[model samples]
Target: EFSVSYDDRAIIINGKRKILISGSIHYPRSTPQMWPDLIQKAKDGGLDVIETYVFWNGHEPSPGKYNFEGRYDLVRFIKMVQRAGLYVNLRIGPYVCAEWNFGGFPVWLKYVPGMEFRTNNQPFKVAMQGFVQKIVNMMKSENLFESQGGPIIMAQIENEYGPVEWEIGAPGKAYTKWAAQMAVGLKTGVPWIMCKQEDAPDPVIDTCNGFYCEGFRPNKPYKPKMWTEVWTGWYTKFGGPIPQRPAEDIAFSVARFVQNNGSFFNYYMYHGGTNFGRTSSGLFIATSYDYDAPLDEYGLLNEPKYGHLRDLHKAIKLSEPALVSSYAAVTSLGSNQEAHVYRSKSGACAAFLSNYDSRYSVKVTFQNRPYNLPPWSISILPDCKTAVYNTAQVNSQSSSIKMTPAGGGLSWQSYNEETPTADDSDTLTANGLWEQKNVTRDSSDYLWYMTNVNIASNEGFLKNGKDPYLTVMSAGHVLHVFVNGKLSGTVYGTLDNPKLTYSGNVKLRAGINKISLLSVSVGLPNVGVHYDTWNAGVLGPVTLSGLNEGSRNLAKQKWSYKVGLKGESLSLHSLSGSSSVEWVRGSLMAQKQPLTWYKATFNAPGGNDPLALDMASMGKGQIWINGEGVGRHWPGYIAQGDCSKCSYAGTFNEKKCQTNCGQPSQRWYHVPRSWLKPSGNLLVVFEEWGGNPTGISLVRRSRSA
Candidate 1:
């Protein structure tokens, strides 16, 4: 059990106290099977506690439906840590603003009648409370609390609610107070923590979250000073170059926090795994969430920082007794220097030496004892004797990893994507008349706009369709159009800075004209004070007033509208050799035409690691295997000229970070092993923008153990 007590020096943990080092490892980030290995690595690297935030969406995806199984199994995760003989700290932020999609809110939650978040509103609070109770009930059943001889030593409620407190006003404080009351009511027999909350009430310990917390102090002197989130690195986004926050910098931050009277601190992401399904909210996250952490996207070892932090945590734990009690003397050494000599007044003196210089090296004298300190690094001297761990150095073995093809051997098969229509040369596919639908949900990123118009004037007859002017006003994002099944033109806005309103033009055709427009969304406009008000789908006043062509405005005519594709209604992705799904075959030839479906089969790659299908051949569309929507893809949606060479230095707000300037928005598709059967898996695609599948290939990465 955690009995909190402290002297003038540091806070006590259990009966014998000291400075504690913790790291955040979100339970849902990796699989349950991977939990033990991850936690063991964390402990082996000198972590005293495994910290994590309970992802609300990951668990309770739908309202009444709950999924605490598999990776969502929090109780199992906590038990694994305890079995490793380590402590646990759970931050149940039910509302974690980790730059996640919808800031980690369930899409269904937004439909929660009049429920504004972080406020005293009944709709929001009721849902939050219900979710919290579910979490508490699960943890209690497992006896995962400290008082019950369990591993969880601390729990948090309403994460960093104070940062945007002004946005919510009195409702913020009321909601926070109510949240705290409800959390403590859980009776988990552990103290509750609220990071970045300045107005935390008594019984609830308010903490900090950031890179550097050396100068941060608690609201009360008696309260324990802790850093809930030690952001080791930032999250990775698609189109962005991989970000790396060197070990030395993270070590410097950690050493500084503990040296400045911090009893506990946690790393935000120890391992940022795959987004898996469409779980990647297009808000900003890349498919590879690596988070520039101690572990990469593939669970490979993120060296230097991993080893460096391990050593630092070990050295800090050694000074537990002196830190928890007034067993020594604390003093500054010199310029860009710091020192804490813990002398028990019985010849037992321990010292922590640090040099906060950003670029230059420095040596300092503490109590007439001389020591060498590197710039932006710290030295831990046990008993003013030997330097046990230095922030600037690492001595752990470098871990290298590789990916092997899954399945036994490999084979290949193909299918034809030719639209089965016998040439329609006689049919006059006219355009001008069209209809629009306010898509109530985020369906496939595209909708085929088809309309036919009769060009009565032979005067403007010989006009070119390639350059015929046709402008369309859309609600938001990019849109491409075609005339009579012929490639008229395609236009999209800045991918990085996608707009809520978009206007593009296409060429008009001769004779009978068929206008087919495809409007798509990059990610949704999901962030902002009142983001809910904005309409999602193609809100359009599709103006196609003839430029050098015929007359009469196009908007005034009655048009026919279709929601999705005819193939989607047929379940093509789940096409099994033995299933009711049919496969009509024809010769394979890649073409840039609309309304085409492609099918191919490749031997499941060899090995046990995850698999990625190189769908560069397939055009912009959705991929399905054995019947599952892997996710929407738009290799065609190239990145804009913005995001580039991002710096991970100083403080990181979304703006300061940089990423993918000009590149394909998405190029790879994940084919999970579970989704495949023993035979060569059947792959299906509903190609909306016509891409040749000839360049399609299977690639596997090779890594050393």
Candidate 2:
């Protein structure tokens, strides 16, 4: 067994103090086949640890029912990290707010009687403690703790709860303390951390999270300065602009933290993976949770960000002797220029010269020697006299990625997903409109709200010889209006505004008319106070306007609700069920038609390189290959605003550095090679707002000049 402990300066492992670099790689985000390479690449990048949160919803889909196979294999991932000779930082947030759906809580929790989330509620605590203990017990049984000669050295309890604590009042505070006590009570023989929690109980270290945490100090003097999440880049939404953080700025942030005597920090996502299936949250967080990390969603190196940070880690390692033994002596050189020097009793010294200016570079004298510092950059001197690495200097090569067509042309077979009739077994009638989340429980993205409105011959609009406008005010990410079983119009909302009103003229007959409204949720809200109460679907005042008398409200009408599409019920997206439904072969008849399913087959791309689906031709829907879900695709939702060449000199925000402004927010969808077959790989697409399937193609990512 290895000794794992920490002091105020650094983490001590096996009787040695060390500056540790770590990275987050959520296991479910990538396939099990990808774990080894990802862990190895992280180690190659100078990372000493591999960190990840155990997604509660992913592990326990239902209460007392567990699933640890495939992507959810926590033990396998930890074993792979250990095999790479790296330590593990297991953050069991059970409430991990990693932009994951419902903030990583299982949907079933919301249904528990008297359940209140993230507070001192009995039901919530019971469920939370149950899952947490389950994971701990599993790890213990596998001997996966450091005390058992395993790689895991640290565990985190609550994640970023300080910001939301006050809102929940005393209950939040009480819960925080209870959580800390409960974690320590587990006796895992390692330190427990609470990132961004100020009042973390004794022996529980309070750490920092953000783009820059150099100014962050632990709540206690005896606690070590640690950062659990240093965002390498921000996440992108479906209808939002793609964000990129410059390598220089990322390097600058890390070096500044190292310069200020910070001993441990982890990249929030060293390799941000795909949000396959319905796991994405924040209402519209894109399927690709790329985060513009050092390793892209495809697990390929993201150029200078990867290599540059690798160099930074090396410099930090070289200065470990002085860094672990002493604190920094800070001195101001000039305006926005400063120097931090660490001198140990053993005569080992390390220095950092920094220029915090965002506009100009400057020359600074450190230890009576001249050194150049770039704007918002830092220079590391392991010997205190020789500058070994500069944050602004990038010696690594940058790659221009290109997506080229792979395999042969695709021949698609189309199937029209028939709209639900009254005969559907899953259909239910409610007196009023129901909330999407309440009705569907997030089991599917699409929910059909159908009602019949009887119109007499004496109706005002009919007498006036004009079609009345069907108006719907909905809490929606997307809504489709079907009048008398015919698609009238489709309306959607953006990431900033997920609620919209749709008004369209529809021809109505004198008898009873069917009004079917399909409400689609891009994803659920994953963060914020009271985010659980956020509602989607048509929570509205449905009306008919342009009448001779007045507008009529249909809000009180008896509505028939259907949870999901018929294709989903039949498992049409899977290989085994592909033959259960009749599909038109070699036909483009369903092209550009909504509510259609398209299937095709192609040979797997010949290479070890990562693959991506050219989803630019698709509107919005989900894709599956060989029965494994790829994720939701919406390449037709082109990004808005102007594009510009980005400058890395200033402080960073999601909007500061923008690209793909006029193009689709996500045009390419990652297709892991492990999920593909050498030949006859079945590809199924359930297209909602359809596009030409002829335009869909398989592509491979290749590095360019």
Candidate 3:
């Protein structure tokens, strides 16, 4: 049995002190069949440990209901990592804030009365305790901890609580302490950690999570310096440019951290798997979570980054003994450059030279050997004499991924998803407008709010020489307004504020005018203290406002709510061989029409290339293949031309080196190979906004050395 212990310098396993390189690979992010190969890739990349967050929402979608089969099978994943001779760092953040939907909290918990999450609230704590305990008990039952001859050596309690702990003040602090105590009580036979938590109490090691954690130190002197999340790249949003952090800069960051006395660190995503299904959260996130990691969404090596980081990991391991034995001593190299050298009493030595200046490359001499450095990069000299790896110099080759059609021809079928009728409808009627989550509970992306307004001829004074403007104050990622069974206007939330407003002019025919409000969720609120309780969809005082006259509130009207589209009610996505389904087959394949559903059948692309649907032609909507949801795709919004080509020679930020300038932020949505059949796969598109299906096709991404 192995002993999992830690000191100020390093984690000691068995009888040896060690410095390790770890990488995050969430299980639910990728298919179960992909786990073995993914873990092997991590091993090949010089990673000693495989890190993953136990996605509570993915596992326990509802309270008291737990799913550990297939992708949610955490035990199988850890076993695969073990079979590959690697350790595991399991982060049990039932409140994982990894850009996950609702920050990985169960939506049912949001319904819990007096349930304030991540605070000193009884209801929240009881739920949190039950889930955490269940996971621990499961691990114990399977003998999964390292002490029980398993792979897991470390486990984390809550994640990144320091950033929002102040929101709840003393209660948050008390909750954190209580959480620590609860976690420690589990007796997992492994060290428990809390990343980005400054006030982490006893027995829990506080770690750092960010782009750079080279200057970070442990909260307690007895604790080892750990960089939990070295963000290799930033997360991509639905309507924003794809952010890219240079592989060289990442290499620089890793080298610097290891050189600066960091003993344990993990890449936030050594492989950023897909968000898959409705698992993406925090108002918005793309279906493909490629994250520009060493491994792409398809489990393909992200090349230069992969190879370069592999070399860097090797170089760091060469200095591991010296690093664990002694702390680094830093000296100035003039200007903003510095030399950090670690020397052990046993004559082992390692050094790192860093250039902090954003402009002008520098040439510095560390041990009589002059080394050239680029602006904002680091060089690792394993022997403190020979420079083996430099962050700016990427010896790996660059690659280009292209999209191609599946076959010689494409066929399409059309079905309409717009439901405007109200007679004996499959809808729930409320006296007032219901919150989207309360009504839908994440059952679907579309929530329809239907009502009838009586315009008694002189309903109100016309504004702008037109009818009264239908004003909706909504917490919507995307909102579509329909007046009198006709499409009115569509408005969406901005990147900064997901909760937004939409105002559209409506024509009332002086009778009972049907008003329908469709609020779409790009994703749920994923961060903050009580984000689970945050509102989604139209939490509105939807009104008919005339700037010239007065406003009429429709907040408490006899509104009828529909959870999803009519096609969804009919299971058009599943399509279990039915004749009642009217599938119109024609040359005019419903191109560029709002409230339309288009279906196509194409042979699954052969070979090992990761599959993706080029939804660049389609507007904002959801796509499904063979009755399974691939995820939501929004190709309508054109990214502003503010992004520029990435520079490998500067400090890295989320905004640095952005790509997809003047283009759809996420043009391609990931379609897992496992999700596709060999041939005649049913491809369905629910075009919520509007777009042509002529440009939609299957594409593949292949990496070259």
Candidate 4:
């Protein structure tokens, strides 16, 4: 039995050499039951450690009221890692900048008065400390530590604070120091690490994070240097074409790090699971949370990447004995240039020859032996005898993920749209008045403005002329109309034209014509300097006009309003293991229906993979399964803008990469494996726009290779 420790340029564990291969897997991103399986896959793929961040928003959805059950079961996830005979590196980045919405900081934190996080503020520090203490105490209770015979070997404090702290000046530096001290004061019985923060205070290990870190040296010689986030690939954004880093290139980078005096490196995401529900971040986080990882969204091996990296990791482990026992130094083997080798004090030698060129391949000699180094890659020769691994030489099969619309035996159905004309309770007929009001909160998409019109003399349009038409001015994302139990017209706004008033000619007898207008926003006005104040409901100038310019204004009509849907009170989204609830059933029809609830039960096509239910037939409305809110879906709310070209050269940004134009904003919904019941799973949907659910099918998912 031996213990693991670190030195200047190596990792010493249990009196033997060590070089950890780690990966990041956030707990909230996946389910509790799936954690062990994900970790096991990473371990089998040659990972020595699992890393993750403690998400603040998930734990504390609201202030004080904390929920740690189910997917938020982080302690359970971490303990699984420890119990799996593997090491753990808990990166409790309270301010994790993992491209998460608002950098993983909960939005509620913004509403707190006199509260400022990641700065010199006692209020923020108080909250931060409370969370840290909770995590620490919980872990301690479970005896999850190396000292307690568990596997957590490393714990990180504040995340990348230096990048922003210095900009805040003295307060930033002071707070950083304070944060470091606070973290170390807990005495977590493990080495403390701070990634990308160079001046990470005393007694804390500052690590590097980037695509390449071969030249990154530690601040102190006595401390063991580590590469915390060895980014093998990048994350994909909504509506954007896939962003990928070649396996050959990533392996090249890893080989360089292992060969250049590196001890430990953790891939950012060996397996990036799912972002089910509204947990996804960004203004447009696609339904898929596939992060282009070694293991795809659905836990399948990502081919060359998974295989290639595994081999490289194995090679590094094989050379760990010589690497850790040796003190590496640079020496010129030729006239101008030479090879740097880490030769053990005990005579076990390993060499790394480089040809850092994209065009030219070089022949280099190490230990008086000749070796060929390919362009833009490294050559690793352990014992200076035979070349064990080469970066450029990809001993893997190049692959592709061909996607064909699996349309065999697939059923199709028409969408049933809900309009004011179809409601059983004709509130619009009861009231004949309407007024405009601006709502501050961008909450519900539907805003009901009801009013009943007085039937007088059949004079103009409603008389011997054409049927009366309801005209209303609206800042419309989309608008649906109903006049006295009769369907009018439906008009929607997308990217090409964000606004269009819906109106049409309709026959109206001389009677009170109740008009109800449904207003829907196309993802709220997302981009303007003062865009937050953009009103999203019916701003009115209601009227009825005839051919001779004979018009009657109805803006002064008394309007009755109901804030939300009647189905909302039922809590249909609370899928908490209950199937006794009643469901409303009707004859299968796909015409415009104002308010209707649809329910059905189907087996979850089998297995725990990232699955999506294509709701192309769905009109527009929210859905609840077993009772979980899958968010709002509108097949007509197609992806806006263009995606004609893709450029992989230079640098990559969200704006630089693009795709998925003219497609539904989210026609597909992620159904987590844990959410699937063993038998008849209830899927209840209240279709607002009268969409036929007969075409619904569960699409079995698979991770990309």
TM-score of 2: 0.97
Query: Which segments of model 2 are wrong by more than 4 Å?
Result: 280-282, 421-426
Clashes of 1: 18
- Cα error, residue 682 of model 4, in Å, equals 2.3
Model 1 RMSD, rounded to 1 decimal: 5.4
Q: Candidate 1, residue 642: CA error in Å? A: 9.3
Q: What's the CA error at residue 602 for candidate 4, in Å?
A: 1.8
Query: Of models 2 and 4, which has the larger TM-score?
Result: 2
Q: Write down the TM-score for model 1.
A: 0.82
The candidate that wins on TM-score is: 2
User: Candidate 1 overall Cα lDDT vs. reference?
Assistant: 0.64
Per-residue alpha-carbon lDDT of model 2 for 12-35, expressed as tens digits?
Answer: 888888898999999999999899
- Mark the regions of model 4 whose C-alpha exceeds 4 Å error after superposition: 1-6, 10-17, 280-282, 331-338, 398-566, 573-588, 591-599, 606-610, 615-624, 629-669, 684-695, 701-705
**Can you write out model 4's per-residue Cα lDDT over 127-177, one digit (the tens) per residue?**
888888777777778877665667787788777777777666788888888
| Clashing residue pairs in candidate 3 (N, C-alpha, C atoms within 3 angstroms) | 101-281, 282-526
Decide which is better by TM-score, 2 or 3: 2
lDDT of 4 at 2: 34
lDDT of each: 0.64, 0.87, 0.82, 0.65
Q: What's the TM-score of every candidate structure? A: 0.82, 0.97, 0.95, 0.74
When sorted by TM-score, best at the front, the candidate numbers are 2, 3, 1, 4
